[PDB]
Design a protein around this nucleic acid. Structure first.
Ligand SMILES: [Mg+2]
Ligand SMILES: [Mg+2]
Length: 114
RNA sequence: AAUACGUUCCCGGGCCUUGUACACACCGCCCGUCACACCAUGGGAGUGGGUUGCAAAAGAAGUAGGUAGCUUAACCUUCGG
């Protein structure tokens, strides 16, 4: 516990920016592209956050080619290179699972602006 | 030797006439089922395409309308905007 807490926080990123459910987020991820290693962008809406120290995670949801793609990131993974908020969204819930039944015009999210 | 009134009836034939779908001409012509082969076609549980009405759903780009957020060399500035 202390031992574990101590093992876990020496592995934790220090500069995770603040973001919240409904925000539009761009995550830059390290990938091996054939024989290259590059950053690849993945942009979408944060529909779920799991706050849990080192095991923190978050689910980003986007539309590719008419169909939805959801990516669960482990926030502290070295695979995740950076996170940046592209727009601040206004929602009430913590978990936006209802957006999965919505498409295009129905799935929009107002801007927070404050 | 017998017998013949007579021509209604049988058979062959002649002339006039009539009907005919016959003309290798009534031993003529021709009809439908049935059997076999071929052709095209209708119906047929269905199978696969084209086009189309109605009722809704969808909403890329563009253009126009609105505009709190962000941003801005030329004009105004009392230099803050
Ligand atoms: Mg006679
Ligand atoms: Mg037929």
């Amino acid at each position: 516990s202390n031992i574990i807490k101590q093992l876990e926080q020496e592995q934790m990123k220090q500069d995770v920016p603040s973001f919240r459910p409904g925000d539009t987020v761009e995550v830059k991820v390290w990938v091996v592209e054939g024989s290259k290693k590059r950053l690849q962008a993945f942009e979408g809406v944060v529909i779920a956050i799991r706050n849990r120290g080192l095991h923190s995670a978050f689910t980003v949801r986007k539309i590719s080619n008419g169909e939805g793609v959801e990516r669960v990131f482990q926030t502290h993974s070295p695979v995740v290179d950076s996170i940046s908020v592209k727009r601040r969204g206004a929602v009430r819930k913590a978990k936006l699972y209802y957006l999965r039944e919505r498409t295009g015009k129905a799935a929009r999210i107002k801007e927070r602006l404050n």
